Amino acid sequence: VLSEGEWQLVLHVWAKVEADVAGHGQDILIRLFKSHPETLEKFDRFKHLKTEAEMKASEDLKKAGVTVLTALGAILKKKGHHEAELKPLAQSHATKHKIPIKYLEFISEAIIHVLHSRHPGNFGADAQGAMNKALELFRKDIAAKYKELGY
Ligand code: HEM
């Protein structure tokens, strides 16, 4: 459970992302792919991309970044009341895309990495704490649906 002050922090951080959704989302996916190459293999849509330059130049990767962050942004703004929004993502990711929960931990770390990279001196220690908590809560709640389905 996050406090109100912690959710306020999360959403102030998210306001930074909303100023350049496609940029943050592309950066997040690139970091994920480069740090954890097994993640890229799950995307028939992107597995042609070999080099970071190709990833950076991929307009479709930007579009995927918008899609991901649009969904995560809406989720965060529910401030934990996100059962309706998580259900379809659990189903798709566990059963169709075959994404292990470990890879959600990896994308969570990518988010923190990219926020630090883009906002040096402006991503506060309190904010990092709160954002970690929010992402932990998301993973816990998705993980429960995975467990249900045998994943
Ligand atoms: C914050 C975490 C995540 C969010 C909010 C998210 C959100 C989404 C959304 C909204 C879609 C499109 C709708 C759907 O199929 O359900 C999608 C598709 C997909 N996601 Fe995720 N995702 C996340 C993490 C991951 C991770 C970590 C991976 C892989 C390592 C992954 C792999 C995929 C794949 C393969 C697709 C289908 C892409 C396509 O072929 O168009 N997702 N995701």
UniProtKB/Swiss-Prot annotation:
Keywords: Cytoplasm, Heme, Iron, Metal-binding, Muscle protein, Oxidoreductase, Oxygen transport, Phosphoprotein, Transport. It is found in: Cytoplasm, Sarcoplasm. GO terms for cellular component: extracellular exosome; sarcoplasm. Monomeric heme protein which primary function is to store oxygen and facilitate its diffusion within muscle tissues. Reversibly binds oxygen through a pentacoordinated heme iron and enables its timely and efficient release as needed during periods of heightened demand. Depending on the oxidative conditions of tissues and cells, and in addition to its ability to bind oxygen, it also has a nitrite reductase activity whereby it regulates the production of bioactive nitric oxide. GO terms for biological process: removal of superoxide radicals. Heme b binds at H93. It is an enzyme of class 1 (oxidoreductase). This is Myoglobin. It comes from Physeter macrocephalus. The modification Phosphoserine is found at S3. Monomeric. Its EC number is 1.7.-.-, 1.11.1.-. The keyword Membrane does not apply. It comes from the Eukaryota. SUPFAM superfamilies: Globin-like (SSF46458). The gene is MB. Gene3D superfamilies: 6.10.140.2100, 6.10.140.2110. Belongs to the globin family. The modification Phosphothreonine is found at T67. It catalyses: Fe(III)-heme b-[protein] + nitric oxide + H2O = Fe(II)-heme b-[protein] + nitrite + 2 H(+); H2O2 + AH2 = A + 2 H2O. Changing G121A: In metmyoglobin. Residues 1-147 form the Globin domain. Nitrite binds at A64. O2 binds at A64. One of its GO terms (molecular function) is nitrite reductase activity.
